[PDB]
């Protein structure tokens, strides 16, 4: 409903067609902005997910 | 299976009854009882 | 009219249900009927195969009588007052073996306590004449069984009950205690009712999960089967026991609703607790000390028994041609007969023939040792229709044991013919 | 929730890692909070 | 809503307020079912506060004080009438309660009826 | 309850049993003085609680379910009466 | 304490709130005959027997009697702890028992049945005592007055007994109304006494 | 049988109070409410994925719930949907004050 650009544009379509709406995985813009602002004061924030099954670490953008 | 009351009802007494009815009959029955008592109260007033 | 199992029987008084209905007992899709055997529960509607379970009866906690299995003794409907003399009698019982005695005492108290469902319901329970429990059996009946070991156990049990009555119902007892069991036959009726009608389940009342032994009204009218239509479930929130139809089973009108009392047990146990015996007890044992062994896998194949050893069932789709010979007893047979199964090497046909005869020999010996033949037994049973109920039971135990030995002979032979196509 | 600059600095220096185990944190990330329907069981 | 409930259950004048002179020198309606009573109120036969007597077939649920009977009147053939303030219990030699009558007002019966009917209605709907 | 309460050789209540108004009253009649209760201060962690320590829910009258936010409810409960 | 335990199958048992009273029973077809010669009283539902306080002369011969109970119903609202727990609880609470002599020891079936209200005996729960009542016959007709037109009125917590003629009885509303008027009058005066002008006022 | 309860029964069914009663029955079989909400949501998704065009005035969540009740023996209409027997004509709207 607020601030996820890709996701927002899809829901209007699912509804007109009659489909189901998936749960979003990417971050909202609000979060992306914070990272950019911090990277402006020379600090870095990263989000990683560690897979339970194989132990791999993946960096979400 | 309910008591017959021959004395007045004031606000304290209604809270005690709604509480007692929730425990014996459950929230669903109590909701219907509540809507019906409302109608009676508005009409008499 | 349509032929249904229920048709033969007659409807019970309206009052069986009413006494319960005023308290919150509800029955759905069910009736209740009476017959010579006693009350039984039947169906009144058709249910198609179903996705999840359906409730047939809901019985509230207050109607029931219950005691916990472990040592701090907690009685959930809580009829007994604090300081009453009955607790001392209940407390002085071995925690592990006697629960029957504790339950008996509680039932007797209930009959003396006002406004307790049991005062009303007990009128519907079996009388001394109509109960099959063997605690209430004479020397003669015990003799007719023809088994030394079952007979002995029963006598030890009869004595245990008398001893309790003497020890606790002595002369100096306060009258409250005395009134409950003035004569010793009353204690015995009570132990008989406890043993025959008790159910063990795990119950959660509030936040306490405990395991208990309980006497529950209206659910005792179900009968045993080893291929059961229904089961028992505790619904915690409304504090009720639910009897429920198993998922996926078609039930047609007029059918009998059944539950399974104990699982995995032989006919000797059913007689000690319930005075009932079954021609087909899938788990019964006939003992052969004879050396010979037939090969296992083939046995299963000829008679189409499929499954793991623990669970054997007849696949009926494989048996396109309508067969009937295979029943509980052939399954029982599989487990009992000594068998050899090695690797994958196929059995030699002549080699096995030796085994079949040697095994059958043992069966002939067994049948002979008994005083009478199977046909003779039916005659005694048919001769007197009205007789002490315990006596008909004893004769029927005999007929049943013999009949299973006979079935095995018939079956081992069929193996022979089919080994060689 | 109060001293934003001060906390952030101390942390950047120490390379702090936060396992996101609370409610407010997961809200910022726009992900399902681990309570109720979200708690998985 | 509370005002209305209070008014229904408030009651009636009891002694000096209802009679000018002592009743010594010298209420009436008796109804068999509650429905009739509610009906009379509509037809203006009685008022909300007028006292009435209602037959009760059930089991003494009336909340009242622990008060012994004001007068027991006992007759020779064997029937005894017991007058308590809010109720009359008629009993016989075999010690059986032939009748119970409750002294009340229309307002009290109206609240009971609504609570009872709602319970029964919800039950009949489920089915 | 965290321990059994006994009057003579009989048990009024057993461990792991919830207390309601009827039980409390029995304890008052029979004068059972020391009662031990599991409480939020008795739990073994500070990042979470267990159902038994918290106890019955104010909303639904049964033991709290796994997954409930006890903390947000506490803050709100102390605070809302504050306007008065 | 008697020191012997009686057979209670031979005794009438009358139960009152705080006591159980036992009186001997001579055998009879309708169970109406009483002997006041042997009596015992026991704490409720417990079996240590004891001798009653007898406060009056007691009959020395068999008497046919009828029994009635006096008391108050108690309705309580009990605490609710389970889903279908009871909302109300009602108890009879008997406090006194009145035993009245059948006339001429006659039997119910006879066309001539009446009760002799002159002889009434009371059993009291609080004091564990048995006594005889004092009746005031205000009914003209003398000792020979017909017993088919007699009514007994009991008032005052069982402490007043009177026999009056039947037609002169008061309807149920009048008894209630009379009582309310007395109480209400006394209460208004109590309120109005405090005012400084009471001495110079008139009830109207 | 109480004599005059007819209107109240018509209304309870018509109003949608039936649904409320049903939700309660069904939650009397469950320890965690949160899980039951998740189970029902999943069933509804399967139903809409398999036959998309049935739904729109018939709601999937309602269908899952009616199906549960009918399996257990209480007759409920499909998706708790009831017609207005007395509507004047096409393009007419009831004023449910």
Curated annotation (Swiss-Prot), chain A:
Task: Describe the family membership recorded for this protein in Swiss-Prot or TrEMBL.
Answer: Belongs to the RNA polymerase beta chain family.
- Quote the function comment for this protein: DNA-dependent RNA polymerase catalyzes the transcription of DNA into RNA using the four ribonucleoside triphosphates as substrates.
Cell compartment(s), UniProt: Plastid, Chloroplast
Quaternary structure annotation from Swiss-Prot or TrEMBL? In plastids the minimal PEP RNA polymerase catalytic core is composed of four subunits: alpha, beta, beta', and beta''. When a (nuclear-encoded) sigma factor is associated with the core the holoenzyme is formed, which can initiate transcription.
Report the source organism. Answer: Nicotiana tabacum (Common tobacco)
Q: So which residues are the signal peptide here?
A: none
- Recorded protein name is DNA-directed RNA polymerase subunit beta
Swiss-Prot record, chain B:
Q: Where in the cell is it found?
A: Plastid, Chloroplast
Q: What does this protein do?
A: DNA-dependent RNA polymerase catalyzes the transcription of DNA into RNA using the four ribonucleoside triphosphates as substrates.
SUBUNIT field? In plastids the minimal PEP RNA polymerase catalytic core is composed of four subunits: alpha, beta, beta', and beta''. When a (nuclear-encoded) sigma factor is associated with the core the holoenzyme is formed, which can initiate transcription.
Q: Which family does it belong to?
A: Belongs to the RNA polymerase beta' chain family. RpoC2 subfamily.
Q: What is this protein called?
A: DNA-directed RNA polymerase subunit beta''
Q: Which organism is it from?
A: Nicotiana tabacum (Common tobacco)
Q: Which residues of the parent protein does this chain contain?
A: 10 to 54 of 1392
């Amino acid at each position: 409903k607020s601030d996820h650009i890709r996701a927002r544009q899809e829901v209007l379509g699912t509804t007109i067609i009659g489909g189901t709406i998936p749960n979003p995985e990417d971050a909202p813009e609000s979060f992306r902005l914070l990272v950019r602002e911090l990277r402006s004061l020379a600090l870095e924030l990263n989000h990683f997910l560690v897979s339970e099954k194989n132990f791999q670490i993946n960096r979400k953008e | 299976n309910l008591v017959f009351h021959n004395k007045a009802i004031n606000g304290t007494a209604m809270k005690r009854l709604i509480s007692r009815l929730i425990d014996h009959f459950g929230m669903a029955y109590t909701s219907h009882i509540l809507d019906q008592v409302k109608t009676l109260g508005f009409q008499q007033a | 009219p349509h032929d249904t199992p229920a048709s033969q029987l007659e409807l019970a008084d309206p009052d069986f249900y009413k006494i319960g209905y005023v308290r919150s007992f509800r029955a759905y899709g069910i009736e209740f009927r009476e017959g010579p055997d006693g009350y039984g529960v039947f169906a009144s509607r058709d249910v198609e195969p179903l996705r999840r379970a359906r409730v047939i009866m809901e019985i509230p906690l207050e109607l029931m009588l219950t005691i916990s299995k472990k040592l701090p003794w907690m009685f959930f409907p809580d009829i007994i007052p604090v300081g009453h003399p009955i607790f001392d009698i209940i407390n002085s019982t071995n925690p592990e073996t006697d629960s029957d005695l504790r339950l008996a005492c509680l039932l007797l108290y209930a009959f003396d306590c006002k406004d307790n469902f049991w005062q009303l319901y007990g009128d519907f329970l079996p009388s001394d004449d109509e109960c099959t429990s063997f605690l209430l059996a004479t020397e003669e009946d015990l003799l007719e069984l023809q088994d030394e070991k079952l007979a002995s156990t029963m006598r030890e049990q009869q004595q245990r009950a008398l001893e309790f009555w003497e020890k606790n119902w002595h002369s100096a007892v306060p009258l409250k205690i005395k009134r409950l069991a003035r004569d010793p036959e009353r204690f015995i009726w009570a132990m008989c009712i406890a043993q025959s009608r008790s159910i063990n389940l795990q119950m959660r009342i509030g936040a306490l999960v405990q395991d208990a032994n309980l006497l529950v009204p209206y659910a005792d009218m179900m009968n045993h089967s080893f291929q059961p239509n229904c089961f028992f479930h505790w619904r915690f929130k409304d504090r009720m026991l639910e009897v429920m139809i198993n998922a996926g089973q078609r039930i047609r009108k007029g059918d009998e609703m059944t539950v399974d009392y104990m699982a995995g047990q032989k006919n000797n146990f059913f007689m000690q607790r319930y005075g009932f015996s079954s021609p087909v007890n899938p788990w019964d044992v006939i003992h052969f000390t004879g050396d010979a062994k037939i090969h296992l896998d083939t046995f299963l194949s000829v008679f189409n028994i499929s499954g793991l050893p623990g669970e054997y069932y007849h696949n009926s789709r494989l048996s396109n041609d309508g067969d009937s010979f295979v029943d509980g007893a052939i399954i029982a047979a599989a487990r009992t007969l000594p068998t050899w199964s090695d690797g994958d090497l196929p059995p030699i046909p002549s080699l096995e023939r030796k085994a079949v005869k040697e095994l059958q020999e043992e069966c002939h010996q067994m049948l002979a040792e008994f005083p009478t033949t199977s046909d003779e037994d039916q005659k005694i049973l048919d001769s007197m229709p009205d007789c002490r109920r315990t006596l008909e039971a004893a004769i029927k135990y005999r007929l049943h044991r013999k009949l299973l030995i006979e079935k095995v002979i018939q079956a081992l032979d069929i193996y022979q013919d089919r080994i060689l196509f | 929730f109060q001293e934003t600059a001060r906390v952030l600095a101390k942390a950047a220096l120490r390379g702090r890692i936060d396992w996101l185990k609370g409610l407010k944190e997961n809200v910022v990330l726009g992900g399902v909070i681990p309570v109720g329907t979200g708690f998985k069981g | 809503m509370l005002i209305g409930l209070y008014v229904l259950t408030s009651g009636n004048h009891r002694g000096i307020c209802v009679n000018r002179y002592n009743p010594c020198n010298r209420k009436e309606p008796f109804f068999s079912n509650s429905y009739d009573a509610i009906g009379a109120y509509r037809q203006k036969r009685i008022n909300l506060d007028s006292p009435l007597w209602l037959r009760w077939r059930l089991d003494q649920r009336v909340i009242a004080s622990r008060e012994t009977p004001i007068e027991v009147h006992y007759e020779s053939l064997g029937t005894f009438y017991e007058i308590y303030g809010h109720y009359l219990i008629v009993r016989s030699l075999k010690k059986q309660i032939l009748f119970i009558y409750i002294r009340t007002t229309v307002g009290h019966i109206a609240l009971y009826r609504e609570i009872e009917e709602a319970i029964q209605g919800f039950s009949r709907a489920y089915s | 309850l965290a321990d059994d309460i006994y009057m003579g050789p009989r048990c009024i209540a057993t461990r792991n049993q919830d207390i309601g108004i009827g039980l409390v009253n029995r304890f008052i009649t029979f004068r059972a003085q020391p009662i031990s209760i599991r409480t939020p201060f008795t739990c073994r962690s500070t990042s979470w609680i267990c159902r038994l320590c918290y106890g019955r829910s104010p909303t639904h009258g049964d033991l709290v379910e796994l997954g409930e936010a006890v903390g947000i409810i506490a803050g709100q409960s102390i605070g809302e009466p504050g306007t008065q | 304490i008697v020191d012997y335990r009686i057979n209670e199958e031979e005794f009438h048992k009358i139960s009152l709130l705080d006591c159980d009273f036992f009186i001997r029973k001579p055998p009879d077809p309708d169970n109406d005959v009483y002997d006041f010669r042997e009596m015992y009283v026991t704490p409720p539902d417990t079996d240590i027997y004891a001798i009653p306080r007898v406060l009056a002369p007691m009959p020395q011969k068999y008497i046919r009697c009828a029994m009635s109970d006096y008391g108050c119903y108690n309705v309580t609202e009990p605490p609710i702890d389970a889903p279908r727990d009871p909302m109300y609880k009602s108890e009879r609470e008997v406090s006194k028992v009145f035993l009245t002599k059948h006339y001429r020891n006659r039997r119910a079936g006879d066309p001539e049945f009446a009760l002799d209200f002159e002889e009434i005996y009371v059993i009291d729960s609080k004091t564990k005592s048995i006594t005889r009542a004092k009746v005031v016959v205000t009914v003209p007709g003398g000792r020979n007055r017909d017993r088919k037109n007699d009514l007994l009125v009991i008032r005052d917590n069982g402490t007043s007994f009177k026999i009056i003629p039947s037609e002169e009885r008061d309807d149920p509303t009048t008894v209630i109304e009379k009582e309310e008027w007395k109480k209400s009058r006394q209460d208004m005066e109590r309120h109005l006494r405090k005012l400084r002008d009471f001495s110079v006022s008139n009830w109207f | 049988r109480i004599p005059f309860l007819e209107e109240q029964v018509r209304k309870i069914r018509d109003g949608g109070k039936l649904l409320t009663m049903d939700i309660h029955r069904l939650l009397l079989n469950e320890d965690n409410r949160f899980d039951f909400v998740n189970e029902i949501a999943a069933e509804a998704k399967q139903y809409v994925e398999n036959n998309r065009d049935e739904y729109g005035a018939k709601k999937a969540i309602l269908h899952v719930l009616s199906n549960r009740m009918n399996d257990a023996g209480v007759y409920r209409a499909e998706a708790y949907m009831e017609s207005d027997p007395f509507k004047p004509g096409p393009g007419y709207l009831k004023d449910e004050l």
